[PDB]
PDB file of C-alpha atoms in Angstrom:
ATOM      1  CA  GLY A   1      -5.887 -13.929 -19.883  1.00 47.79           C
ATOM      2  CA  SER A   2      -8.465 -12.738 -22.261  1.00 50.87           C
ATOM      3  CA  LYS A   3      -7.598  -9.238 -23.433  1.00 47.57           C
ATOM      4  CA  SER A   4      -7.962  -7.463 -26.768  1.00 45.88           C
ATOM      5  CA  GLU A   5      -4.322  -6.559 -26.972  1.00 46.57           C
ATOM      6  CA  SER A   6      -1.301  -6.588 -29.181  1.00 46.84           C
ATOM      7  CA  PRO A   7       1.919  -5.715 -26.960  1.00 46.13           C
ATOM      8  CA  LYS A   8       4.081  -2.779 -28.281  1.00 47.32           C
ATOM      9  CA  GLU A   9       6.268  -2.653 -25.238  1.00 48.09           C
ATOM     10  CA  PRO A  10       9.729  -4.534 -25.238  1.00 48.99           C
ATOM     11  CA  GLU A  11      10.534  -7.229 -22.617  1.00 47.53           C
ATOM     12  CA  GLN A  12      12.229  -4.613 -20.439  1.00 45.33           C
ATOM     13  CA  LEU A  13       9.244  -2.492 -20.434  1.00 43.44           C
ATOM     14  CA  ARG A  14       6.835  -5.218 -19.312  1.00 44.59           C
ATOM     15  CA  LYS A  15       9.238  -7.310 -17.188  1.00 43.83           C
ATOM     16  CA  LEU A  16       9.483  -6.764 -13.439  1.00 44.18           C
ATOM     17  CA  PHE A  17      12.470  -7.424 -11.182  1.00 46.29           C
ATOM     18  CA  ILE A  18      11.515  -9.112  -7.861  1.00 43.45           C
ATOM     19  CA  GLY A  19      13.915  -8.448  -5.170  1.00 42.80           C
ATOM     20  CA  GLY A  20      13.924  -9.910  -1.610  1.00 41.60           C
ATOM     21  CA  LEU A  21      12.260 -13.207  -2.426  1.00 41.97           C
ATOM     22  CA  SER A  22      12.394 -16.145  -0.054  1.00 43.20           C
ATOM     23  CA  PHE A  23      15.204 -18.723  -0.103  1.00 43.47           C
ATOM     24  CA  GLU A  24      12.484 -21.296  -1.188  1.00 42.03           C
ATOM     25  CA  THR A  25      10.590 -19.119  -3.527  1.00 40.05           C
ATOM     26  CA  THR A  26      10.001 -20.988  -6.677  1.00 37.67           C
ATOM     27  CA  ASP A  27       9.170 -19.631 -10.183  1.00 36.76           C
ATOM     28  CA  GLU A  28       5.819 -21.445 -10.334  1.00 38.12           C
ATOM     29  CA  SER A  29       4.916 -19.696  -7.038  1.00 41.25           C
ATOM     30  CA  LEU A  30       6.222 -16.278  -8.196  1.00 36.74           C
ATOM     31  CA  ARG A  31       4.113 -16.422 -11.393  1.00 34.69           C
ATOM     32  CA  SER A  32       1.049 -17.533  -9.580  1.00 35.36           C
ATOM     33  CA  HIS A  33       1.220 -14.595  -7.168  1.00 32.95           C
ATOM     34  CA  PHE A  34       1.979 -11.837  -9.724  1.00 28.40           C
ATOM     35  CA  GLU A  35      -0.465 -13.502 -12.257  1.00 26.47           C
ATOM     36  CA  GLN A  36      -3.271 -12.175 -10.040  1.00 27.62           C
ATOM     37  CA  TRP A  37      -2.826  -8.772 -11.484  1.00 30.54           C
ATOM     38  CA  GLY A  38      -2.200  -9.830 -15.127  1.00 29.47           C
ATOM     39  CA  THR A  39      -1.217 -12.394 -17.595  1.00 30.31           C
ATOM     40  CA  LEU A  40       2.458 -13.411 -17.122  1.00 30.09           C
ATOM     41  CA  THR A  41       4.249 -14.567 -20.345  1.00 29.84           C
ATOM     42  CA  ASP A  42       7.391 -15.437 -18.429  1.00 29.94           C
ATOM     43  CA  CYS A  43       8.710 -15.888 -14.888  1.00 26.82           C
ATOM     44  CA  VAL A  44      11.898 -17.123 -13.388  1.00 27.38           C
ATOM     45  CA  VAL A  45      13.505 -16.983  -9.961  1.00 29.38           C
ATOM     46  CA  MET A  46      17.243 -16.533 -10.081  1.00 26.37           C
ATOM     47  CA  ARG A  47      18.354 -19.703  -8.481  1.00 25.09           C
ATOM     48  CA  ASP A  48      21.817 -20.953  -7.750  1.00 25.57           C
ATOM     49  CA  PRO A  49      23.274 -23.404 -10.515  1.00 26.50           C
ATOM     50  CA  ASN A  50      25.399 -25.128  -7.920  1.00 24.31           C
ATOM     51  CA  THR A  51      22.955 -26.113  -5.134  1.00 25.96           C
ATOM     52  CA  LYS A  52      19.739 -25.212  -6.933  1.00 27.39           C
ATOM     53  CA  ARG A  53      18.471 -22.813  -4.221  1.00 24.30           C
ATOM     54  CA  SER A  54      16.792 -19.490  -4.662  1.00 21.84           C
ATOM     55  CA  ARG A  55      19.149 -16.340  -4.631  1.00 23.27           C
ATOM     56  CA  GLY A  56      16.263 -14.297  -3.334  1.00 23.76           C
ATOM     57  CA  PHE A  57      15.409 -12.466  -6.481  1.00 22.59           C
ATOM     58  CA  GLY A  58      13.726 -13.033  -9.920  1.00 19.17           C
ATOM     59  CA  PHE A  59      11.813 -11.609 -12.783  1.00 17.62           C
ATOM     60  CA  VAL A  60       8.176 -11.791 -14.031  1.00 15.88           C
ATOM     61  CA  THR A  61       7.272 -10.748 -17.550  1.00 16.59           C
ATOM     62  CA  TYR A  62       3.719  -9.398 -18.031  1.00 17.41           C
ATOM     63  CA  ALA A  63       1.758  -9.495 -21.273  1.00 16.48           C
ATOM     64  CA  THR A  64       1.239  -5.695 -21.410  1.00 18.13           C
ATOM     65  CA  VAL A  65       2.812  -2.705 -19.576  1.00 17.70           C
ATOM     66  CA  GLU A  66      -0.567  -1.761 -18.179  1.00 16.15           C
ATOM     67  CA  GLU A  67      -0.792  -5.119 -16.258  1.00 17.59           C
ATOM     68  CA  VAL A  68       2.689  -4.236 -14.929  1.00 17.35           C
ATOM     69  CA  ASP A  69       1.678  -0.773 -13.560  1.00 13.26           C
ATOM     70  CA  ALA A  70      -1.179  -2.573 -11.591  1.00  9.09           C
ATOM     71  CA  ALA A  71       1.339  -4.762 -10.097  1.00  8.53           C
ATOM     72  CA  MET A  72       3.621  -1.921  -9.392  1.00  9.31           C
ATOM     73  CA  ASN A  73       0.915   0.094  -7.660  1.00 10.59           C
ATOM     74  CA  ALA A  74      -0.198  -2.934  -5.768  1.00  8.87           C
ATOM     75  CA  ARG A  75       3.077  -2.857  -3.825  1.00  9.77           C
ATOM     76  CA  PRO A  76       3.994  -4.052  -1.316  1.00  8.66           C
ATOM     77  CA  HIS A  77       3.790  -7.650  -2.267  1.00 12.32           C
ATOM     78  CA  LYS A  78       4.275 -10.941  -0.404  1.00  9.57           C
ATOM     79  CA  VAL A  79       5.183 -14.096  -2.229  1.00 10.73           C
ATOM     80  CA  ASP A  80       5.846 -17.278  -0.263  1.00 11.96           C
ATOM     81  CA  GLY A  81       5.270 -15.438   3.086  1.00  8.74           C
ATOM     82  CA  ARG A  82       8.056 -13.077   1.967  1.00  4.33           C
ATOM     83  CA  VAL A  83       7.856  -9.364   1.494  1.00  2.53           C
ATOM     84  CA  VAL A  84       9.068  -8.983  -2.130  1.00  2.00           C
ATOM     85  CA  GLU A  85       9.969  -5.726  -3.871  1.00  2.00           C
ATOM     86  CA  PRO A  86       8.837  -5.787  -7.528  1.00  4.11           C
ATOM     87  CA  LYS A  87      10.566  -3.265  -9.645  1.00  5.22           C
ATOM     88  CA  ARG A  88      11.318  -2.361 -13.252  1.00  2.00           C
ATOM     89  CA  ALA A  89      13.585  -4.622 -15.206  1.00  2.00           C
ATOM     90  CA  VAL A  90      16.325  -2.003 -15.651  1.00  2.00           C
ATOM     91  CA  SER A  91      18.214  -1.919 -18.975  1.00  2.00           C
ATOM     92  CA  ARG A  92      21.691  -3.278 -18.826  1.00  2.00           C
ATOM     93  CA  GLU A  93      23.197   0.063 -19.414  1.00  2.00           C
ATOM     94  CA  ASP A  94      21.616   1.534 -16.358  1.00  2.00           C
ATOM     95  CA  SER A  95      21.732  -1.701 -14.567  1.00  2.00           C
ATOM     96  CA  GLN A  96      25.623  -1.492 -14.843  1.00  2.00           C
ATOM     97  CA  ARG A  97      25.506   1.475 -12.455  1.00  2.00           C
ATOM     98  CA  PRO A  98      25.772   1.393  -8.650  1.00  2.00           C
ATOM     99  CA  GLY A  99      22.412   1.157  -7.087  1.00  2.00           C
ATOM    100  CA  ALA A 100      20.438   0.344 -10.226  1.00  2.00           C
ATOM    101  CA  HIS A 101      18.132  -2.315  -8.873  1.00  2.00           C
ATOM    102  CA  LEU A 102      17.837  -0.330  -5.714  1.00  3.50           C
ATOM    103  CA  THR A 103      14.776   1.807  -4.847  1.00  3.38           C
ATOM    104  CA  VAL A 104      15.658   4.952  -6.563  1.00  3.66           C
ATOM    105  CA  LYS A 105      12.939   7.514  -7.205  1.00  2.00           C
ATOM    106  CA  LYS A 106      15.281  10.333  -8.232  1.00  2.00           C
ATOM    107  CA  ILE A 107      16.686  11.094 -11.565  1.00  3.62           C
ATOM    108  CA  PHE A 108      19.479  13.241 -12.965  1.00  8.18           C
ATOM    109  CA  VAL A 109      18.972  15.413 -16.068  1.00  6.70           C
ATOM    110  CA  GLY A 110      22.139  16.975 -17.467  1.00  6.07           C
ATOM    111  CA  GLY A 111      23.406  18.777 -20.488  1.00  5.98           C
ATOM    112  CA  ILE A 112      20.342  20.939 -20.931  1.00  6.81           C
ATOM    113  CA  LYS A 113      19.872  24.322 -22.591  1.00 10.15           C
ATOM    114  CA  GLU A 114      20.934  27.725 -21.197  1.00  6.48           C
ATOM    115  CA  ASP A 115      17.923  27.524 -19.026  1.00  4.53           C
ATOM    116  CA  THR A 116      15.150  24.999 -18.370  1.00  6.97           C
ATOM    117  CA  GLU A 117      12.072  25.482 -16.249  1.00  8.10           C
ATOM    118  CA  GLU A 118      10.433  23.084 -13.777  1.00  8.25           C
ATOM    119  CA  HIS A 119       7.353  23.244 -16.035  1.00  7.07           C
ATOM    120  CA  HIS A 120       9.394  21.950 -18.902  1.00  6.01           C
ATOM    121  CA  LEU A 121      10.712  18.681 -17.416  1.00  8.59           C
ATOM    122  CA  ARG A 122       7.938  18.307 -14.712  1.00  8.65           C
ATOM    123  CA  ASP A 123       5.261  18.147 -17.448  1.00 11.04           C
ATOM    124  CA  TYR A 124       7.476  15.647 -19.212  1.00 10.67           C
ATOM    125  CA  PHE A 125       8.441  13.368 -16.516  1.00  8.48           C
ATOM    126  CA  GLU A 126       4.867  13.425 -15.020  1.00  4.72           C
ATOM    127  CA  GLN A 127       3.776  11.439 -18.045  1.00  4.63           C
ATOM    128  CA  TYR A 128       5.863   8.649 -16.518  1.00  5.98           C
ATOM    129  CA  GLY A 129       4.466   9.118 -12.962  1.00  8.54           C
ATOM    130  CA  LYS A 130       3.554  11.218 -10.022  1.00  9.14           C
ATOM    131  CA  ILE A 131       6.385  13.805  -9.100  1.00  8.00           C
ATOM    132  CA  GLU A 132       6.927  14.905  -5.462  1.00  7.00           C
ATOM    133  CA  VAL A 133       9.246  17.766  -6.018  1.00 10.74           C
ATOM    134  CA  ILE A 134      11.496  19.203  -8.731  1.00 11.21           C
ATOM    135  CA  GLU A 135      15.168  20.166  -7.950  1.00  8.58           C
ATOM    136  CA  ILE A 136      16.512  22.766 -10.314  1.00 12.80           C
ATOM    137  CA  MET A 137      20.220  23.137  -9.965  1.00 16.29           C
ATOM    138  CA  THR A 138      21.532  26.626 -10.536  1.00 14.83           C
ATOM    139  CA  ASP A 139      24.586  27.672 -12.482  1.00 15.65           C
ATOM    140  CA  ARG A 140      27.240  29.124 -10.226  1.00 15.79           C
ATOM    141  CA  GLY A 141      28.737  31.419 -12.851  1.00 14.89           C
ATOM    142  CA  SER A 142      25.953  32.737 -14.964  1.00 16.00           C
ATOM    143  CA  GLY A 143      23.298  32.290 -12.281  1.00 15.96           C
ATOM    144  CA  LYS A 144      20.950  30.600 -14.725  1.00 13.01           C
ATOM    145  CA  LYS A 145      18.861  27.567 -13.934  1.00 12.86           C
ATOM    146  CA  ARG A 146      20.950  25.340 -16.322  1.00 13.69           C
ATOM    147  CA  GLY A 147      23.718  22.796 -16.552  1.00  9.05           C
ATOM    148  CA  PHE A 148      21.641  20.045 -14.966  1.00  7.79           C
ATOM    149  CA  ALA A 149      18.412  19.325 -12.956  1.00 10.94           C
ATOM    150  CA  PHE A 150      16.972  16.766 -10.688  1.00 10.68           C
ATOM    151  CA  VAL A 151      13.573  15.236 -10.398  1.00 11.66           C
ATOM    152  CA  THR A 152      12.059  13.509  -7.317  1.00 12.55           C
ATOM    153  CA  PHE A 153       9.364  10.902  -7.963  1.00 15.79           C
ATOM    154  CA  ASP A 154       6.728   9.357  -5.674  1.00 15.63           C
ATOM    155  CA  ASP A 155       7.598   5.926  -6.925  1.00 18.69           C
ATOM    156  CA  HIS A 156      10.753   4.304  -8.263  1.00 19.07           C
ATOM    157  CA  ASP A 157       8.880   2.687 -11.205  1.00 18.49           C
ATOM    158  CA  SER A 158       8.358   6.022 -12.918  1.00 19.29           C
ATOM    159  CA  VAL A 159      12.185   6.800 -12.563  1.00 20.59           C
ATOM    160  CA  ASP A 160      13.021   3.314 -14.042  1.00 14.55           C
ATOM    161  CA  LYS A 161      10.736   3.884 -16.890  1.00 12.69           C
ATOM    162  CA  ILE A 162      12.925   6.966 -17.638  1.00 10.42           C
ATOM    163  CA  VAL A 163      16.423   5.527 -16.908  1.00  8.38           C
ATOM    164  CA  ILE A 164      15.662   2.873 -19.519  1.00  6.64           C
ATOM    165  CA  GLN A 165      16.220   5.515 -21.972  1.00  5.20           C
ATOM    166  CA  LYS A 166      19.484   7.252 -21.087  1.00  4.93           C
ATOM    167  CA  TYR A 167      18.603  10.352 -23.370  1.00  6.90           C
ATOM    168  CA  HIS A 168      15.072  12.061 -23.538  1.00  6.00           C
ATOM    169  CA  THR A 169      13.671  14.753 -25.631  1.00  9.05           C
ATOM    170  CA  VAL A 170      12.607  17.527 -23.331  1.00  7.49           C
ATOM    171  CA  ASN A 171      11.319  20.723 -24.760  1.00 10.11           C
ATOM    172  CA  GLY A 172      12.723  19.965 -28.147  1.00  9.34           C
ATOM    173  CA  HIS A 173      15.994  19.170 -26.719  1.00  9.64           C
ATOM    174  CA  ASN A 174      17.856  15.793 -26.064  1.00  9.56           C
ATOM    175  CA  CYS A 175      18.942  15.833 -22.455  1.00 10.91           C
ATOM    176  CA  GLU A 176      20.820  13.061 -20.652  1.00 12.79           C
ATOM    177  CA  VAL A 177      19.030  11.223 -17.754  1.00 13.88           C
ATOM    178  CA  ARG A 178      19.892   8.552 -15.344  1.00 12.84           C
ATOM    179  CA  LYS A 179      19.647   7.155 -11.736  1.00 12.73           C
ATOM    180  CA  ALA A 180      20.174   9.873  -9.153  1.00 13.63           C
ATOM    181  CA  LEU A 181      20.956   8.494  -5.821  1.00 12.28           C
ATOM    182  CA  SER A 182      19.985  10.274  -2.602  1.00  9.80           C
ATOM    183  CA  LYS A 183      23.064  11.683  -0.547  1.00  8.36           C
ATOM    184  CA  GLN A 184      22.321   9.125   2.098  1.00  5.25           C
ATOM    185  CA  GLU A 185      22.152   6.379  -0.483  1.00  6.64           C
ATOM    186  CA  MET A 186      25.413   7.636  -1.996  1.00  2.00           C
ATOM    187  CA  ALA A 187      27.172   7.827   1.406  1.00  2.32           C
ATOM    188  CA  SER A 188      25.986   4.625   2.866  1.00  3.72           C
ATOM    189  CA  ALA A 189      27.739   5.702   5.950  1.00  7.55           C
ATOM    190  CA  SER A 190      26.927   5.820   9.648  1.00 13.09           C
ATOM    191  CA  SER A 191      24.827   8.980   9.952  1.00  7.61           C
ATOM    192  CA  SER A 192      24.634   9.808  13.730  1.00  7.71           C
ATOM    193  CA  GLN A 193      22.430  12.890  14.286  1.00  3.64           C
ATOM    194  CA  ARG A 194      20.224  13.630  17.297  1.00  2.00           C
ATOM    195  CA  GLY A 195      18.198  16.553  15.861  1.00  2.00           C
ATOM    196  CA  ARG A 196      21.779  17.855  14.943  1.00  2.00           C
TER     197      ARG A 196
END
């Protein structure tokens, strides 16, 4: 502990979702591990109410969002001899979508203006994290860079920071954002290519 701090961030903004735990991972063990990076205020492994065994996922709540980020960047993690995937505690609106707690570093931005530049949304979304590339989707009718855009992040954490808020104000305009799944992720089918 010991930090001159007064948290301003809601539980969802300082809680992490731990995926891929062991079948024997306890909440005491889960805390103890992630507590290395910051003060945990809460921790619980989602166990079965029937047999009281671990469902292989849980959550850890940090004191401050900053301590969360330090745990985010510290990935990958290993609790109980198990490679665990700490992620952002997705808001129930976005967590109601297919592939919400999955590792998604892509977001959709729709319902924008007559044109929007990379510089606009890149400079905005980069506040949340490092961006790999920006996908600007063009209009087929007008030929303008409008209608919707896509943003590729280096980490899933930055995307999840964003999808927590379905609508964001970019360049003085409220645009809609959400999880954007990669085409492989969306298909989930047997891709058989041999260079072709």
